[PDB]
Symmetry: D2
């Protein structure tokens, strides 16, 4: 109604790219000799993938749209992308895959925040 269809499309594409980035990054950190120091990073990637996957699906549905549901789901996705971007950024010096995943998390956080701002 008042919603930016382009910002909605961007959010959906970002959630799918970020979910896959975090799935791949959990697996990549799992395979590091350093894995013992990367456990919060792996766990946060797992959460971030689960929430981005759910958010992409909810935002993809227009039938019987409920702003309360959509707002609460975007907030959850913003919050986990922010936490996961921070955690991967701390591992960025130990692995190029975490630098890349941190960028994905930050990009998706911004896409959720931009949509959130428009209601």
């Amino acid at each position: 109604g008042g919603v930016d269809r382009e910002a909605m499309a961007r959010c959906i594409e970002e959630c799918l790219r970020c979910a896959q980035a975090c799935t791949a990054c959990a697996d990549a950190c799992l395979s590091e000799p350093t894995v013992a120091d990367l456990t919060k990073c792996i766990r946060t990637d797992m959460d971030c993938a689960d929430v981005c996957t759910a958010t992409a699906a909810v935002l993809s549905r227009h039938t019987g749209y409920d702003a309360n549901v959509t707002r609460a789901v975007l907030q959850a996705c913003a919050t986990v992308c922010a936490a996961c971007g921070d955690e991967c950024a701390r591992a960025a010096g130990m692995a190029e895959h975490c630098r890349v995943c941190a960028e994905a998390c930050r990009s998706c956080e911004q896409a959720c925040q931009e949509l959130l701002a428009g209601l």
Copy 2:
């Protein structure tokens, strides 16, 4: 730390039961002759299943626990269970499966709210 482990267990069990309830209820409303009047109900069941599935997974992980992430995910799950309980309750007179699913949604909403209250 200050968290009720029993309330956490209840939330996880409720999310899985509620996700399956809503998957089954979307399918059941799809198969109703009335389906044309049950479209918001079906869509809300789809969202409610996706969010309960993600919430069960996030709450099942203790490594590198982040209260900000967990709070935002429980809020999203509470909000969608409340919306989906309301929508199925409106269809309760048209199908026994919606009365049952409304109860599941209300039960999981209360489990998320009770955990949320404890932080």
Copy 3:
């Protein structure tokens, strides 16, 4: 080891695009005046999204790779993309969104089959 890394990347990208296509197509058919005639289409889109989502995740993980697991998951994803491409193709005359989703299903079926063939 003997695996085509490029075919693996293509499969992952196709599963995510196809999962979102089928989520959107279930929602689009839900919103059609015709919805009563589109119920198998909607149900198949739901399955196809769930299986493409799981397949993208499994194929994204290289740690402790098991060809038996990967083969069985690619087979499931091929089979549901084939069924869902066929079902959306039958609705293609009733809605442009089903023609588009049928193409996505066929594209992902071929990506899974091509990877399957390489083991």
Copy 4:
């Protein structure tokens, strides 16, 4: 039609219990001092959770039922529960949580196999 409704119900309940078991077991092995030796176990738990989640959803839908899709999805779930039961069984001496998860994987493998056998 010829399907055991009770075996279908058991499969659905087992997939949800096994998905949560494997989510919890990935997290538990992540938190072990031994984590470096538990990486295949963690990865297999991640796959096993993703596939059990998708299988529970597909088996929960009766509208426009397709035996080809259902068979291929049950096969994938059987195969990953068998691989994940074996991998957790190897860690059973290092952690009680893996002994418990191995039992869940074996229980769900048998539920999928029993349904598969009935078509």
